């Protein structure tokens, strides 16, 4: 319902403000540390410039022994200090009303169906969807034997990869999925070409080699 | 402790600074990643609250929303919990084997005291490091002075306790920002003074302390005590 989604949106907005509070806290700690590190840097610089004269000074041996024995431990404790508990506690609480996998897949199938209903191409929809997003949609289709959508979305994922989008997915796996889905469509020509793309990328790929031969076969027997 | 040992310590400390700087870089990269994420998301969810019906119209906005909440916030969570400090802490931990310890710090402090005696220097000249024919310009903090006073105190050296607590208190008086309260140093000071025998000074300082903190139990006891023995003197 509209209301459930509305509450989700509000929750996420609050999570963002809380997140920004965490960021602010961490930045303040880092600036304290940065200033500290600046002081130490000027210090150590002057000492390394002339270590003998440095340990001439009667105060310097004491100050050095103190910094090393005491101050660096204070510094250590500040570095290790956890700034994240408020945000994590809060997020932990909000997760109670979060969606699950089934909600996510469901929302995805809904995306496919809207794609059909409004006659939209994957690029226009994607422009935002990431390569990984497209790939996921492709796999959602794939699990239900909807190879038309599997095909369209793996194609989009691959296209985004080609435009040089940085992503966690390699062209090879998506080429595998794609060529498989296309073969299942019946476009053996396309499937063959894509298989050849895959082999150009990973030449040792077992199924792609086997499929190069097998596709050439059934194509011959057509 | 030799020139060479000090030199090795100094180089190690220089390297630890480099390591800490690397830590700073790592943390900044982490935070900037997070800020950009939150920036992007803030744009989304703001536009969404403006018209939530129109926003979750798209199965796209809805799909991205469900995914962000079920998966991506867990990724952000993992990034938040991610320790950027391991390299620095590991290196510092390793170097600490060849660090000075407590005895070395006390040792260096007493060494400083004996040097003060030997060259007849007042605590101010030493503390401000303004020294003739010496190039490096180090200075002691009120807190440093306090520590020297306490090192003296531990050895029943009330002469140095008195001098160095007086220097600390004096630096506090200029309003040097510091971690020490005048009251603790006044405690030490007045006690050391009395141990030397200057009952008037100890009494006056006890009164300064109480003037600062009137509920200070021990100071109260000391006030009655001093006034008594002063009267029966």
Swiss-Prot record, chain B:
TPR repeats mapped onto the chain: 183-216
Its annotated compartments are: Endoplasmic reticulum lumen
Q: In which tissues is it expressed?
A: Expressed in the heart, liver, skeletal muscle, kidney, placenta, lung and pancreas.
Q: Tell me which UniProt keywords the record has, alphabetically.
A: Dioxygenase, Endoplasmic reticulum, Glycoprotein, Iron, Metal-binding, Oxidoreductase, Signal, TPR repeat, Vitamin C
A Gene Ontology term for the protein's cellular component? membrane
* Glycosylation positions in this chain: 91
User: A GO biological process this protein is involved in?
Assistant: collagen fibril organization
The question of whether Metal-binding is a record keyword is answered with: yes
A single Gene Ontology molecular function, please? identical protein binding
Subunit details: Heterotetramer of two alpha-1 chains and two beta chains (P4HB)(the beta chain is the multi-functional PDI), where P4HB plays the role of a structural subunit; this tetramer catalyzes the formation of 4-hydroxyproline in collagen.
Give the family from UniProt.
Belongs to the P4HA family.
**Physiological role:** Catalyzes the post-translational formation of 4-hydroxyproline in -Xaa-Pro-Gly- sequences in collagens and other proteins.
Protein name (record): Prolyl 4-hydroxylase subunit alpha-1
Q: Which organism is it from?
A: Homo sapiens (Human)
Q: Which gene encodes it?
A: P4HA1
Task: State the covered range within the intact protein.
Answer: 23 to 255 of 534
């Amino acid at each position: 319902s509209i209301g459930q989604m509305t509450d989700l949106i509000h929750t996420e907005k609050d999570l963002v403000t809380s997140l920004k509070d965490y960021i602010k806290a961490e930045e303040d700690k880092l600036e304290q540390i940065k200033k500290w590190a600046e002081k130490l840097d000027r210090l150590t610089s002057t000492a390394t410039k002339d270590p003998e004269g440095f340990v001439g000074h009667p105060v310097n041996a004491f100050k050095l022994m103190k910094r090393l024995n005491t101050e660096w431990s204070e510094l250590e404790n500040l570095v290790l200090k956890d700034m994240s508990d408020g945000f994590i506690s809060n997020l932990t609480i909000q997760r109670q009303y979060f969606p699950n996998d089934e909600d996510q897949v469901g929302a995805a199938k809904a995306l496919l169906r809207l794609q059909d209903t409004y006659n939209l191409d994957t690029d226009t929809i994607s422009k935002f969807l990431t390569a990984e997003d497209c790939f996921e949609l492709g796999k959602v289709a794939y699990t239900e034997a909807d190879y038309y959508h599997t095909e369209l979305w793996m194609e989009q994922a691959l296209r985004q990869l080609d435009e040089g989008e940085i992503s966690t997915i390699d062209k090879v796996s998506v080429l595998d999925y794609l060529s498989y889905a296309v073969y299942q469509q019946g476009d053996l020509d396309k499937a063959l070409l894509l298989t050849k793309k895959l082999l150009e990328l990973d030449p040792e790929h077992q199924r792609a080699n086997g499929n190069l031969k097998y596709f050439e076969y059934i194509m011959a027997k057509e």
